[PDB]
Swiss-Prot record:
Effect caused by changing residue 209 to M: In GLC1A; uncertain significance
Substitution effect: residue 137 to N: In GLC1A; uncertain significance
Effect of residue 104 to N: In GLC1A; uncertain significance
Taxonomic lineage of the native organism: Eukaryota, Metazoa, Chordata, Craniata, Vertebrata
Protein name in the entry: Myocilin, C-terminal fragment
């Protein structure tokens, strides 16, 4: 099958070191060999070719800085969180136009609901086989992970789920085939995928899938559904994790 439940994660493989991003729904005039780099934060460097990816073909200046590296490129736009805000911005790359701005309702930001190793990781953007998502929490949710499916055109919240896991108790989270998975570790860098919440059914469960992790750091993890792989940035290297689905 093409989608399924996660059953295995591979070892992280190391791939201007980052943060690199690719579009899982490449849209002309961009292609699959188009790459974007966020400098680690207001400039986005664009590389048309993988060959040129070693000088940029274009440099974009964003209307405001990024809060964190938890941005995504999707269907020709950069989606990111504005610094010191709970606002998600859609920046169309080819036209250099802000096409949508949205306050995530009630979302904590700037150190209210970080992941377990901290940083400004309150709000994360994600892409899976069904499109664009945002992962966050609210005071009403008492720090539980909330996830919302976003309309990529106008950033309306098409559907929201309040899950039964505490955001500050997990090191990271990512969405694959409509299921939210969390990564948890008590005191070791190494960890486990310890929880799954299936947005198709509302059913959640505790898991024990090994998840190898190099640092006690709130990494940027970005699932790429086009490649069916996880990409991650640990402040030093871009890495990729292979996955297996049932
Ligand atoms: Na992420």
């Amino acid at each position: 099958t093409g989608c399924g439940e996660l059953v295995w994660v591979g070892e992280p493989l190391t791939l201007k070191y980052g943060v690199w991003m690719r579009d899982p729904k490449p849209t002309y005039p961009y292609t699959q060999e188009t790459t974007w780099r966020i400098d680690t934060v207001r400039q986005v460097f664009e590389y048309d070719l993988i060959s040129q990816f070693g000088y940029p073909s274009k440099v974009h200046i964003l209307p405001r800085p990024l809060e964190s590296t938890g941005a995504v490129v999707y269907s020709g736009s950069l989606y990111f969180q504005g610094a010191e805000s709970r606002t998600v911005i859609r920046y169309e790359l080819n036209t250099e136009t802000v096409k949508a701005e949205k306050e995530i309702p009630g979302a904590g930001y700037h150190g209210q609901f970080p992941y377990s190793w901290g940083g400004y990781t309150d709000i994360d953007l994600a892409v899976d086989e069904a499109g664009l998502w945002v992962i966050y929490s609210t005071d009403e949710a008492k720090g539980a992970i909330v996830l919302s499916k976003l309309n990529p055109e106008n950033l309306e919240l098409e559907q929201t789920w309040e899950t039964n896991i505490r955001k500050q108790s997990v090191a990271n989270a990512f969405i694959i085939c409509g299921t939210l998975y969390t990564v948890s570790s008590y005191t070791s860098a190494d960890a486990t995928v310890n929880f799954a919440y299936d947005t198709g059914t509302g059913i959640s469960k505790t898991l024990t899938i090994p998840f190898k992790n190099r640092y006690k750091y709130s990494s940027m993890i970005s699932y790429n559904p086009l490649e069916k792989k996880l990409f991650a940035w640990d402040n030093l290297n871009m890495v990729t994790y292979d996955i297996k689905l049932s």
